Design a protein around this ligand. Structure first.
Ligand SMILES: Nc1nc2c(ncn2[C@H]2C[C@H](O)[C@@H](COP(=O)(O)OP(=O)(O)OP(=O)(O)O)O2)c(=O)[nH]1
Ligand SMILES: [Ca+2]
Ligand SMILES: [Ca+2]
Ligand SMILES: [Ca+2]
Length: 341
DNA sequence: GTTGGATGGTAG
DNA sequence: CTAACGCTACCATCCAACC
């Protein structure tokens, strides 16, 4: 069938531009301030103006402020971005009811029965692009191909404010030419390990004997690269169900003291149980980011769903568990709920 | 020798 | 305080329980 992929352009940043258009065309940086000191924290994202000077997601707000001291630094308003996202995802639903909301900013439509060929798909893509640009002022990039992965790849090639169709014949061309690093699911750690095996594109995966591919990346990514490269890979647009909900916050200073940390842990619990919204988790994990940025987690699965009261007292037992079992001072603390009924 | 649970890594 | 927030899917690993 034919998959159409939407990825909203510089999302949090753009939304801020829609809310304050006197920002458009000059560098905008959306940050998560951590409160540890003046301008501590990270950059959630940045518009392309900012992005031209290396201000991207994940870098400290202070590294960015040295590069672009005069840029606009805006604190992250996820509540707001989520509202816009929700509305756009709802727009998308009126184009195909076979939707998979993949993330806050991306979604896959299976348009197979709304269009006859890729050319009709492209026009639909333009229809969708305008409709969003008209109803939400957000530019997005559309990637259309035979399936999820490739449609995502097309979007990655056209962004920002782009549209790429990757026809059955174009698919084949990329397998041989696309950098494996650009394959969805292939990050730096996997890229590195694949380059260690002479694997640069997809192609060289069909070259390498399966046996030593899983013997570097595990069974899953191995199957994944191959089905992609053999032009099989069908994965259907399945309606997303949220499997875990969590919240994790940053402390004013690293601490090992149970009492200093609790208020942070509870803040997260409260936030999490709120985001849960009618969902009853049977599992809770307290997650701690150490001083050296290792992420550790202690958790517990219950025979039956967890009440907020249970969450509270178990989280503490779990934080105790982390504190006794891990030497390091904790920097960030939070909780995550899974296994909903 | 699967399925579930706890914990950690990877990636987007 | 001294730079590194936030989220969630899926997978890997280990091991204990177990049909
Ligand atoms: N707090 C935080 N938010 C992030 C981070 N990475 C991404 N996000 C949020 C902000 C982004 O606007 C949003 C969508 O992620 P994308 O990967 O699609 O990047 P973005 O849309 O900003 O650029 P776009 O034109 O596709 O490239 O997700 C991160 O490291 N931290
Ligand atoms: Ca995206
Ligand atoms: Ca995006
Ligand atoms: Ca990559």
């Amino acid at each position: 069938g034919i998959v159409l992929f939407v990825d909203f352009d510089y999302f949090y940043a753009q939304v801020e531009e829609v809310l304050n258009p006197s920002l458009k065309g000059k560098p905008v940086v959306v940050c998560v301030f951590s409160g540890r000191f003046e301008d501590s924290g990270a950059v959630a994202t940045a518009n392309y103006e900012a992005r031209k000077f290396g201000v991207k997601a994940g870098i400290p707000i202070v590294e960015a402020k040295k590069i672009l001291p005069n840029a606009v630094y805006l604190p992250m308003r996820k509540e707001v971005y989520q509202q816009v996202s929700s509305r756009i995802m709802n727009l998308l639903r009126e184009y195909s009811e076979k939707i998979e909301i993949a993330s806050i900013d991306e979604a896959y439509l299976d348009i197979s029965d709304k269009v006859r060929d890729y050319r009709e798909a492209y026009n639909l893509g333009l229809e969708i692009k305008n409709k969003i640009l008209e109803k939400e002022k957000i530019t997005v990039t559309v990637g259309i191909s035979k399936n999820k992965v490739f449609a995502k790849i097309a979007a990655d090639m056209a962004k920002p404010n782009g549209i790429k169709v990757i026809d059955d014949e174009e698919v084949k061309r990329l397998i041989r030419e696309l950098d494996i690093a650009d394959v969805p699911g292939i990050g730096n750690i996997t890229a590195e390990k694949l380059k260690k095996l002479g694997i640069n594109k997809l192609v060289d995966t069909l070259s390498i004997e399966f046996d030593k591919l899983k013997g570097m990346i595990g069974e899953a990514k191995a199957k994944y690269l191959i089905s992609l490269a053999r032009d099989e890979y069908n994965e259907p647009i399945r309606t997303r169900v949220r499997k875990s909900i969590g919240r994790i916050v940053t402390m004013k200073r690293n601490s090992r003291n149970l009492e200093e940390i609790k208020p942070y842990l509870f803040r997260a619990i409260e936030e999490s149980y709120y985001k849960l919204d009618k969902r009853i988790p049977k599992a809770i994990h307290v997650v701690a980011v150490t001083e050296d940025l290792d992420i550790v987690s202690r958790g517990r699965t219950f025979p039956h769903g967890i009440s907020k009261e249970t969450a509270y007292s178990e989280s503490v037992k779990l934080l105790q568990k982390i504190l006794e079992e891990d030497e390091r001072k904790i920097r960030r603390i939070g909780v995550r709920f899974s296994k909903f009924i």
